[PDB]
Design a protein around this motif. Structure first.
Motif, PDB file in Angstrom:
ATOM      1  N   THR A 124      -1.553  -1.981   4.523  1.00  0.00           N
ATOM      2  CA  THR A 124      -0.795  -2.768   5.751  1.00  0.00           C
ATOM      3  C   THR A 124       0.501  -3.638   5.215  1.00  0.00           C
ATOM      4  OG1 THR A 124      -2.087  -4.714   5.426  1.00  0.00           O
ATOM      5  CG2 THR A 124      -2.917  -2.940   6.720  1.00  0.00           C
ATOM      6  N   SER A 125       0.546  -3.888   3.944  1.00  0.00           N
ATOM      7  CA  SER A 125       1.749  -4.376   3.557  1.00  0.00           C
ATOM      8  C   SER A 125       2.797  -3.354   3.209  1.00  0.00           C
ATOM      9  CB  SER A 125       1.545  -5.189   2.383  1.00  0.00           C
ATOM     10  OG  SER A 125       1.125  -4.524   1.027  1.00  0.00           O
ATOM     11  N   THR A 126       2.312  -2.193   2.944  1.00  0.00           N
ATOM     12  CA  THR A 126       3.157  -0.856   2.933  1.00  0.00           C
ATOM     13  C   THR A 126       3.804  -0.550   4.359  1.00  0.00           C
ATOM     14  OG1 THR A 126       2.393   0.010   1.115  1.00  0.00           O
ATOM     15  CG2 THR A 126       3.660   1.355   2.278  1.00  0.00           C
ATOM     16  N   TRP A 127       2.952  -0.840   5.677  1.00  0.00           N
ATOM     17  CA  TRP A 127       3.115  -0.435   6.697  1.00  0.00           C
ATOM     18  C   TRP A 127       4.326  -1.361   7.159  1.00  0.00           C
ATOM     19  CZ3 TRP A 127      -1.832  -0.956   9.842  1.00  0.00           C
ATOM     20  CH2 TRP A 127      -2.674   0.227   9.562  1.00  0.00           C
ATOM     21  N   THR A 128       4.542  -2.616   6.565  1.00  0.00           N
ATOM     22  CA  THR A 128       5.588  -3.513   6.981  1.00  0.00           C
ATOM     23  C   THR A 128       6.773  -2.780   6.626  1.00  0.00           C
ATOM     24  OG1 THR A 128       4.370  -5.345   6.633  1.00  0.00           O
ATOM     25  CG2 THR A 128       6.545  -6.035   6.772  1.00  0.00           C
ATOM     26  N   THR A 129       7.131  -2.270   5.553  1.00  0.00           N
ATOM     27  CA  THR A 129       8.422  -1.632   5.179  1.00  0.00           C
ATOM     28  C   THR A 129       8.801  -0.513   6.103  1.00  0.00           C
ATOM     29  OG1 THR A 129       8.563  -2.491   2.944  1.00  0.00           O
ATOM     30  CG2 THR A 129       9.429  -0.115   3.297  1.00  0.00           C
ATOM     31  N   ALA A 131       7.894  -0.158   9.065  1.00  0.00           N
ATOM     32  CA  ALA A 131       8.216  -0.463  10.465  1.00  0.00           C
ATOM     33  C   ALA A 131       9.665  -1.174  10.369  1.00  0.00           C
ATOM     34  CB  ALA A 131       7.483  -1.872  10.923  1.00  0.00           C
ATOM     35  N   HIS A 132      10.228  -1.496   9.269  1.00  0.00           N
ATOM     36  CA  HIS A 132      11.746  -1.916   9.292  1.00  0.00           C
ATOM     37  C   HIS A 132      12.338  -0.696   9.343  1.00  0.00           C
ATOM     38  CE1 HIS A 132      11.965  -6.271   7.829  1.00  0.00           C
ATOM     39  NE2 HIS A 132      10.388  -5.904   7.848  1.00  0.00           N
ATOM     40  N   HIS A 133      12.097   0.536   8.990  1.00  0.00           N
ATOM     41  CA  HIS A 133      12.822   1.780   9.023  1.00  0.00           C
ATOM     42  C   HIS A 133      12.605   2.282  10.451  1.00  0.00           C
ATOM     43  CE1 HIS A 133      14.773   3.032   5.364  1.00  0.00           C
ATOM     44  NE2 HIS A 133      13.897   2.296   4.739  1.00  0.00           N
ATOM     45  N   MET A 135       9.850   3.558  11.501  1.00  0.00           N
ATOM     46  CA  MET A 135       8.910   4.655  11.431  1.00  0.00           C
ATOM     47  C   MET A 135       7.600   4.374  12.296  1.00  0.00           C
ATOM     48  SD  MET A 135       9.159   5.696   7.499  1.00  0.00           S
ATOM     49  CE  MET A 135       8.791   7.609   7.542  1.00  0.00           C
ATOM     50  N   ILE A 137       3.788   4.209  12.914  1.00  0.00           N
ATOM     51  CA  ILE A 137       2.678   4.080  11.759  1.00  0.00           C
ATOM     52  C   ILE A 137       1.469   4.781  12.288  1.00  0.00           C
ATOM     53  CG2 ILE A 137       1.277   2.569  10.803  1.00  0.00           C
ATOM     54  CD1 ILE A 137       3.840   0.518  10.983  1.00  0.00           C
TER      55      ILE A 137
END
Ligand SMILES: Cc1cc2nc3c(=O)[nH]c(=O)nc-3n(C[C@H](O)[C@H](O)[C@H](O)COP(=O)(O)O)c2cc1C
Ligand SMILES: Cc1cc2nc3c(=O)[nH]c(=O)nc-3n(C[C@H](O)[C@H](O)[C@H](O)COP(=O)(O)O)c2cc1C
Ligand SMILES: Cc1cc2nc3c(=O)[nH]c(=O)nc-3n(C[C@H](O)[C@H](O)[C@H](O)COP(=O)(O)O)c2cc1C
Ligand SMILES: Cc1cc2nc3c(=O)[nH]c(=O)nc-3n(C[C@H](O)[C@H](O)[C@H](O)COP(=O)(O)O)c2cc1C
Lengths: 197, 197, 197, 197
Positions: A124-129, A131-133, A135, A137
């Protein structure tokens, strides 16, 4: 649709998972599937001394991520985050970000830990990044029946496939873990074709 | 494609945002947009005495969520989580979960806070629940140019639209905030039509 | 120091864990330990029909949380968040927040899930709310040796103790899970006495 | 008590915040405060050519973290996570983890972003790693009154101090932001002296 399985692995657990993900994605006709690894950041001598595993997968550049319709990221945990190697690589995607190059592309994540703790937080912490792009999820939910089995120790979450490596790294990904990984690859690739052809 | 904007609002800030999301979604040819609220959980007398706002949107049942292709969830923060009202409603979706009723459906989230703190955590912690249902999660990234403007106090994150209500609730959603909200509805409705016709 | 073990449980798994936490906390001389539950929000008839468990613990009020030096929160997961019952209760702590009543008090969390997924997210999303109140957040790390054992299916994370209830709720908390829970109670109570006497 | 302010800064925004944190911590009688930075991971030529700022703080080793009673971690965001530099450094604390060297030590976090997005996620995702080490996590809540001020663009969250650098990096930490940073150092140093003398 083009599907990149992009991973970091030191001892091969994520590498094994990555191949399973690619095996699932390849079942989707019209999905073109590619497996690449991020660069190692450790000095080669320290990597070898630590008993790190040499890997055949080609090393990705940050720029080439733009070529794909879906990217499935694999990383082992480091205290409940992605690894420094994956973090360093993603920190090099600022050019892609500024151009909107990954916007609307599919993203999904899989992970590995020694004893289970941190496996959810890593995803879920990877999802954060992602989301900034901008993408999209893609979690896996509970379509994979193996997620209902609590009879044996096994990775796998509704957020994405995972494997348990053991404290000493001696476990290998189980049949159930690999099944879940294959499902994640199939499901993401299907969506990529649905969206992008 | 059918798009549900499903929200909780006590004082109308999320209600206003929900209408803007629906406006944006309705711009997409082929998108059927419906706005509903989740049930109040406070005793009615206490809701009124606290100055809660009467709302015209009909109250949703858990079961009707199955009818939509995309669901855009709106909630004010309660200490960095979704509201108890929204949580209580989602807790009644076990039947939908068991049948895979929301699996593969698009999901996106927007929030409101008094002074900003918790607006990101509200969104990402809501994503967790969506992921258990196997929903495809849609962040907005940086497509909305207002996200670059740091010259005025402004809600909005790459995770989803937000608004800042002020400590006393006296602020109204700003034009920039509503623009981001409209963008979110339009973007998600576009994906919904792309995937489902 | 006064230590409140505050929990929600429908089928007794969290209740069993809560008693173990209290058993650990009580080992600390000079820790005064109290176990209370949050109110049920389900209508009594629906609770009974669902086969919910009746519980002896007294029902807490939001206000009385101010009386304690440490609060250890237990909740089952609902799709990777705390339960609506715990959320509703915490949504009633706005008075405490405004007065800074929980500021600097110790907080720690334990959880329960059917099949493991969401157990980390439940704890860390709960931490968010604790942080808004300015509570000091107490994870357990890897002091509890049971966290190293991957030979049997078991809850427990570095974020806090957990139990696995099984898909059908038929599992009972294991010796190892309860050990970890007792440790969490001992550790938090020790800190509470260290800080507050 | 000994307090380490450990940071990564590329352009000096976190450096400035780190100095303010240290200022606040040094106000506490009995607190010994030290400021150090983590190693750069970029090739030096690329660091300079990107306009990276030369810094006077000495570079930390992973091993020296064991010497402190409290560690206050500062990092800019990289897409809603800690920076690769900070991640890479924390990835070298496995020896400390294995020996329980950071167990029970106080930890707190402060961040910086260009335009606000990700500032909360950076903090809370850093907390995850701290929790694996068994550190006692210290959020700041709403004690700092600037957190109530929505009349100007302002970093700062209940999770920890933050600053907004602007899209182009041209903003400098504001007085309100630095006040919150000082409060955080003072608060954490106070806890450190309370617990450790
Ligand atoms: C710096 C470091 C931090 C780690 N943190 C965790 C952890 O938090 N939880 C866990 O179960 N294992 C942890 N491990 C174990 C790794 O996740 C494990 O070795 C990895 O999943 C193996 O995957 P690989 O073979 O693909 O490299 C850590 C290992 C290292 C070196
Ligand atoms: C129980 C409670 C907790 C709250 N927690 C926060 C918070 O953590 N951060 C914040 O900025 N506002 C907080 N607020 C403010 C609400 O989020 C705000 O009133 C809401 O966003 C207004 O939206 P609405 O008009 O749609 O109800 C809280 C309010 C209540 C009643
Ligand atoms: C609405 C709902 C949502 C649930 N979500 C999850 C979940 O995400 N993961 C999981 O493993 N179990 C899930 N469960 C199972 C509960 O967490 C489980 O029954 C609970 O931990 C039992 O604890 P108790 O006996 O203290 O009530 C869910 C159950 C309900 C009713
Ligand atoms: C790779 C990269 C990713 C970034 N991601 C974000 C982001 O998600 N949100 C944001 O507001 N700023 C982002 N920025 C801006 C940095 O966080 C900002 O330059 C930093 O906070 C400045 O602090 P420093 O002067 O201490 O280096 C990013 C910058 C880089 C280089």
């Amino acid at each position: 649709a083009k599907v990149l399985v992009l991973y970091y692995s030191m001892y091969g657990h994520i590498e094994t998972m990555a191949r399973a993900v690619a095996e699932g994605a390849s079942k989707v006709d019209g999905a073109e599937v590619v497996v690449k690894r991020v660069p190692e950041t450790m000095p080669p001598q320290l990597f070898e001394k630590a008993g790190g595993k040499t890997q055949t997968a080609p090393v990705a550049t940050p720029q080439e991520l733009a070529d794909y319709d879906a990217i499935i990221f694999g990383t082992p945990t480091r205290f409940g985050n992605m690894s420094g190697q994956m973090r360093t690589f993603l920190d090099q995607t600022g050019g892609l970000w500024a151009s909107g190059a990954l916007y609307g592309k599919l993203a999904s994540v899989f992970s590995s830990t020694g004893t289970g703790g941190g496996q959810e937080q890593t995803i879920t912490s990877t999802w954060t990044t992602l989301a900034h792009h901008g993408m999209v999820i893609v979690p896996i939910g509970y379509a994979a029946q193996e997620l209902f089995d609590v009879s044996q120790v096994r990775g796998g979450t509704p957020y994405g496939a995972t494997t348990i490596a053991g404290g000493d790294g001696s476990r290998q990904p189980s049949q159930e873990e690999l099944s879940i990984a294959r499902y994640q690859g199939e499901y993401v690739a299907g969506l990529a074709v649905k969206l992008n052809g």
